[PDB]
Amino acid sequence: MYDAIVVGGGFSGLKAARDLTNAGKKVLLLEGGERLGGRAYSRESRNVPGLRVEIGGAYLHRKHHPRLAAELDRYGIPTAAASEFTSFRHRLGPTAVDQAFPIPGSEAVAVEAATYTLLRDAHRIDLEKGLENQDLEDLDIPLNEYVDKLDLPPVSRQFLLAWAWNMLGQPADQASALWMLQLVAAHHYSILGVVLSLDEVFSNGSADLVDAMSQEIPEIRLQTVVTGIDQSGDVVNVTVKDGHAFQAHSVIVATPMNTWRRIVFTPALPERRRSVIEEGHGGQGLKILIHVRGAEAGIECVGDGIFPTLYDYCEVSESERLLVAFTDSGSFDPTDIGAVKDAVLYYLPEVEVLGIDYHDWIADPLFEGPWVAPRVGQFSRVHKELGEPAGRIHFVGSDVSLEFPGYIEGALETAECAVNAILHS
Amino acid sequence: MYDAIVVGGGFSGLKAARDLTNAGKKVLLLEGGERLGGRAYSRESRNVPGLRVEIGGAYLHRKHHPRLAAELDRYGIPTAAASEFTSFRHRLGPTAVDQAFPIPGSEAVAVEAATYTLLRDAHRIDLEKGLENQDLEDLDIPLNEYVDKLDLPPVSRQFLLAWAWNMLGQPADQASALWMLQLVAAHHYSILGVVLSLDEVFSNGSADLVDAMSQEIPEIRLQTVVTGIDQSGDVVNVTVKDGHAFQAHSVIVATPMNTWRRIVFTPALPERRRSVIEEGHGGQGLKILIHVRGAEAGIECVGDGIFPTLYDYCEVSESERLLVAFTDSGSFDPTDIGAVKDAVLYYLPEVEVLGIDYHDWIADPLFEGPWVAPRVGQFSRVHKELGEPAGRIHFVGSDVSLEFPGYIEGALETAECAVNAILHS
Numbered sequence: 001m002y003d004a005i006v007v008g009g010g011f012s013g014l015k016a017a018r019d020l021t022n023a024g025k026k027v028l029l030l031e032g033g034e035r036l037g038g039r040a041y042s043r044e045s046r047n048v049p050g051l052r053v054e055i056g057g058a059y060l061h062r063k064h065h066p067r068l069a070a071e072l073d074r075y076g077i078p079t080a081a082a083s084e085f086t087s088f089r090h091r092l093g094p095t096a097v098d099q100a101f102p103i104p105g106s107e108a109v110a111v112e113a114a115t116y117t118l119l120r121d122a123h124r125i126d127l128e129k130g131l132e133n134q135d136l137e138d139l140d141i142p143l144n145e146y147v148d149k150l151d152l153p154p155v156s157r158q159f160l161l162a163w164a165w166n167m168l169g170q171p172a173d174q175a176s177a178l179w180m181l182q183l184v185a186a187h188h189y190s191i192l193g194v195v196l197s198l199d200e201v202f203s204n205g206s207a208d209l210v211d212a213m214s215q216e217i218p219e220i221r222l223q224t225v226v227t228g229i230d231q232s233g234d235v236v237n238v239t240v241k242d243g244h245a246f247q248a249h250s251v252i253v254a255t256p257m258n259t260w261r262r263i264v265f266t267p268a269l270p271e272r273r274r275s276v277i278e279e280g281h282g283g284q285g286l287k288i289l290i291h292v293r294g295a296e297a298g299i300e301c302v303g304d305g306i307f308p309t310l311y312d313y314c315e316v317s318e319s320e321r322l323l324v325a326f327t328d329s330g331s332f333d334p335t336d337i338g339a340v341k342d343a344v345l346y347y348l349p350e351v352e353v354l355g356i357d358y359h360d361w362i363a364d365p366l367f368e369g370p371w372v373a374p375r376v377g378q379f380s381r382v383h384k385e386l387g388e389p390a391g392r393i394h395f396v397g398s399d400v401s402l403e404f405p406g407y408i409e410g411a412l413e414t415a416e417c418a419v420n421a422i423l424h425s
Numbered sequence: 426m427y428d429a430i431v432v433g434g435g436f437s438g439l440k441a442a443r444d445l446t447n448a449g450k451k452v453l454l455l456e457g458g459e460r461l462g463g464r465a466y467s468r469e470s471r472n473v474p475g476l477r478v479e480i481g482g483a484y485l486h487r488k489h490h491p492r493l494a495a496e497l498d499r500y501g502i503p504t505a506a507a508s509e510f511t512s513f514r515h516r517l518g519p520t521a522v523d524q525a526f527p528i529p530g531s532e533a534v535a536v537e538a539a540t541y542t543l544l545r546d547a548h549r550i551d552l553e554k555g556l557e558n559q560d561l562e563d564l565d566i567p568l569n570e571y572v573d574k575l576d577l578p579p580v581s582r583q584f585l586l587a588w589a590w591n592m593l594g595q596p597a598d599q600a601s602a603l604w605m606l607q608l609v610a611a612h613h614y615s616i617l618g619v620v621l622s623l624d625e626v627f628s629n630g631s632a633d634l635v636d637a638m639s640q641e642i643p644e645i646r647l648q649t650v651v652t653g654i655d656q657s658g659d660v661v662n663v664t665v666k667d668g669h670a671f672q673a674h675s676v677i678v679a680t681p682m683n684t685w686r687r688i689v690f691t692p693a694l695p696e697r698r699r700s701v702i703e704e705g706h707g708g709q710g711l712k713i714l715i716h717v718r719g720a721e722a723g724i725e726c727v728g729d730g731i732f733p734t735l736y737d738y739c740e741v742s743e744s745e746r747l748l749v750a751f752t753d754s755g756s757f758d759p760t761d762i763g764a765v766k767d768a769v770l771y772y773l774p775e776v777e778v779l780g781i782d783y784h785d786w787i788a789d790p791l792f793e794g795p796w797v798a799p800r801v802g803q804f805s806r807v808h809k810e811l812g813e814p815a816g817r818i819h820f821v822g823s824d825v826s827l828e829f830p831g832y833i834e835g836a837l838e839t840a841e842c843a844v845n846a847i848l849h850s
């Protein structure tokens with residue numbers, strides 16, 4: 001038996017397990033898959049032999065992401081911008097300017113007012129309390145309805161929606177306004193910062209940092225899928241798809257939220273959690289690496305295409321690059337390569353698509369989702385509760401961070417809070 | 426005797442007198458000077474024979490200034506932009522961009538936050554109540570102190586202060602933050618709009634519109650300076666520097682605020698008004714027309730010089746132009762032409778100054794001031810009261826508009842309110 005079992009080997013489980021062990025605890029980490037890192041997954045390009053790519057989480061910003069910055073400093077892990085962005089190829093209409101901030105003068109007053117309105121609204125959110133605890137329900141409505149109330153003219157309306165589509169991984173009609181404002185709050189009450197947090201990347205991949213942390217975890221089992229967590233007796237029992245059980249005074253759940261409905265909890269989780277756990281969150285982000293020929297370097301495109309964003313990622317050669325596109329998996333089928341070409345050529349009619357690469361996170365039984373985003377109405381009913389302990393079972397992860405949800409930073413934040421709960425218990 | 430005597434023939438007195446007469450009232454208008462229009466003064470250039478210039482009020486914006494827009498429509502008075510602005514020559518440091526909005530990306534987050542803060546603060550102001558009636562005293566502090574609290578980086582800090590210097594006609598240390606926020610509120614709660622209201626000019630001069638309105642006023646006396654207004658008996662008596670008195674059921678004071686201390690009121694004005702009336706407001710705006718050679722057309726400059734702004738005004742020839750500079754008369758002596766050249770060359774080192782033109786509003790006994798701006802502490806003590814009736818004496822004018830102070834629009838607004846008070850009395 002262990003002081004703690006940590007279930008899931010993403011950044012959240014890795015941090016918890018490491019920190020617990022360093023506190024002198026006896027810790028077991030169980031990972032269902034064949035690798036550690038979870039939604040941070042660097043690996044070889046399917047399109048370009050020998051090229052390492054981020055198929056999930058990649059971008060960070062030291063100022064918004066201080067826990068992560070500490071990890072990088074701790075291990076001397078090198079980072080950089082993926083690219084300098086210099087060529088803008090927007091589809092925002094004939095008045096937009098081809099710059100990173102493409103809003104023309106004629107829209108300045110509208111932007112100014114919308115800035116005030118969005119930030120006023122975001123300032124309603126106290127990040128320690130939970131979105132269900134603050135009379136915020138009037139904001140928990142479809143994003144498109146919220147944005148209609150701003151009455152933005154066309155460049156800025158489409159700019160805002162495009163980035164919002166990108167960032168939440170939902171179309172405007174499925175996204176919660178309140179959740180947008182949450183991301184705004186997380187970035188020190190900044191609209192701009194939501195997109196400026198795409199600031200650097202792992203020079204050598206997210207695996208650089210996954211490997212550093214796991215070197216400090218003495219006991220890891222891969223290919224071990226937890227199917228049951230039972231705290232009816234004095235010590236927690238964790239059953240596994242094909243193994244003995246393992247036992248611990250404490251269990252940390254660090255698997256993705258949309259997988260919890262597959263674990264049998266004994267006794268059942270508190271009832272107010274159960275419905276949202278069953279439904280799952282509504283995130284359908286879809287990040288597609290696109291192998292292309294004839295693209296200039298430094299391209300960024302934002303606009304009204306089925307790819308809201310498309311931007312530079314890495315040089316493959318003098319004539320070939322990878323771009324990255326975000327959309328959502330409910331709106332777009334990445335295996336429809338005819339579709340990919342259309343989506344690309346919309347922004348970049350001169351470019352040829354050579355191939356694509358992505359991971360179907362939503363179909364993957366270890367995930368059942370990309371990054372968190374609530375369905376409308378979800379998180380004003382229950383939010384903070386999802387990441388509270390139930391008896392001796394803790395819930396951590398990005399998905400449930402109040403402070404930086406959907407980011408690597410949020411995995412780290414939640415782990416911190418669990419480690420501490422467990423040390424003071 | 427008259428139904429109404431209107432004292433002062435600026436836009437405020439002209440509107441009142443006209444509207445009253447059209448309501449069937451018997452009205453006398455008394456103007457101290459040799460012309461109608463007051464601080465709207467178009468006349469021949471002192472530097473360029475045959476050229477008509479605005480030596481005071483010139484700029485308008487139909488959307489912010491609807492009463493004025495109505496006057497223009499009423500009389501078919503033509504307007505236009507003075508110039509298209511295309512060349513920017515800022516002194517805001519090495520990071521600024523040479524555009525109308527010169528803020529670089531590195532300052533975007535700071536601007537965003539400052540936008541929120543300024544507008545939140547401005548939204549504290551209800552425009553119908555008076556600045557002394559709203560617990561606003563914490564904002565009534567020196568602008569530079571307020572701005573220090575925003576902690577803006579250099580481009581945006583200097584940009585904001587420059588325009589604020591221009592617009593209030595006071596240096597930051599003498600200007601009230603609360604008054605800045607007032608102008609922000611007046612422009613439909615917009616920072617940007619304060620400067621975007623420089624939208625058009627009178628094609629033929631402000632006199633175009635002064636002459637149209639005065640054609641509808643049957644009785645005007647020029648060169649008649651009011652020295653006394655006495656409502657101790659049943660009918661108001663108005664004494665004049667060298668004339669009979671004139672008598673009226675009602676008297677409208679439409680002279681500038683800083684001249685009221687020269688009129689003997691009987692009985693004395695309510696005591697809470699008296700101190701600010703005695704002190705005067707603190708506006709020291711100074712608008713200088715600068716005759717130049719070797720300037721390209723379309724120049725706008727903003728920066729940290731003793732001229733915060735300098736911009737295009739009119740073509741004189743293929744090689745000569747007038748620019749306009751704003752500063753303040755406490756900081757700058759316009760009769761020091763060596764000073765003018767230095768101030769110009771700071772922005773435009775290639776240009777020769779040929780001459781200058783301005784009106785010393787502050788020395789002029791019919792004015793004792795340019796446009797209104799309160800001393801710090803003034804208008805949180807008394808504001809709305811200054812433009813309320815005292816018995817049968819009304820106080821109108823730009824200086825005392827709650828809705829658009831310091832603009833032509835405010836003269837029109839106040840006149841409207843008096844005419845109406847008098848019709849319902």
Ligand SMILES: Cc1cc2nc3c(=O)[nH]c(=O)nc-3n(C[C@H](O)[C@H](O)[C@H](O)COP(=O)(O)OP(=O)(O)OC[C@H]3O[C@@H](n4cnc5c(N)ncnc54)[C@H](O)[C@@H]3O)c2cc1C
Binds near residue numbers: 007
């Ligand atoms: C496409 C995409 C792009 C992203 N981009 C960024 C980005 O740029 N920047 C950023 O900061 N974040 C990004 N993210 C979000 C970020 O990657 C994740 O939020 C974060 O990595 C999640 O860490 P975690 O430890 O909460 O969960 P995960 O990393 O999901 O870890 C959960 C672990 O649990 C395992 N598991 C599941 N079920 C079981 C079971 N029953 N038993 C045992 N183990 C199980 C999984 O295999 C996994 O290893 C991105 C995510 C995606 C999907």
Ligand SMILES: Cc1cc2nc3c(=O)[nH]c(=O)nc-3n(C[C@H](O)[C@H](O)[C@H](O)COP(=O)(O)OP(=O)(O)OC[C@H]3O[C@@H](n4cnc5c(N)ncnc54)[C@H](O)[C@@H]3O)c2cc1C
Binds near residue numbers: 435679712791792
């Ligand atoms: C340099 C400068 C630039 C400006 N630029 C703009 C601008 O671009 N746009 C804008 O909208 N506004 C501008 N203004 C502000 C605007 O011009 C004035 O606020 C507005 O014209 C004032 O109108 P009024 O009728 O309140 O007062 P005034 O126009 O001042 O009228 C007062 C009248 O009273 C007369 N008078 C004084 N004492 C007596 C006395 N005892 N008896 C009889 N008559 C007396 C004066 O001769 C004068 O005619 C500017 C002002 C200045 C000084």
Ligand SMILES: CN1CCC=C1c1ccc(O)nc1
Binds near residue numbers: 083085100300311
């Ligand atoms: C260049 N811009 C403007 C807004 C966001 C970006 C951006 C996008 C991708 C990346 O790697 N870095 C920056």
Ligand SMILES: CN1CCC=C1c1ccc(O)nc1
Binds near residue numbers: 621
């Ligand atoms: C061009 N800009 C940017 C901010 C203010 C102006 C401006 C100045 C003078 C004028 O006549 N019109 C516009």
Ligand SMILES: CN1CCC[C@H]1c1ccc(O)nc1
Binds near residue numbers: 285309
């Ligand atoms: C940084 N966010 C957190 C979750 C998804 C991720 C992300 C990264 C790049 C991009 O363009 N959009 C979103």
Ligand SMILES: CN1CCC[C@H]1c1ccc(O)nc1
Binds near residue numbers: 484623734796
């Ligand atoms: C429009 N405002 C009202 C009072 C002074 C005037 C003004 C006009 C032009 C300029 O550059 N600054 C200020």
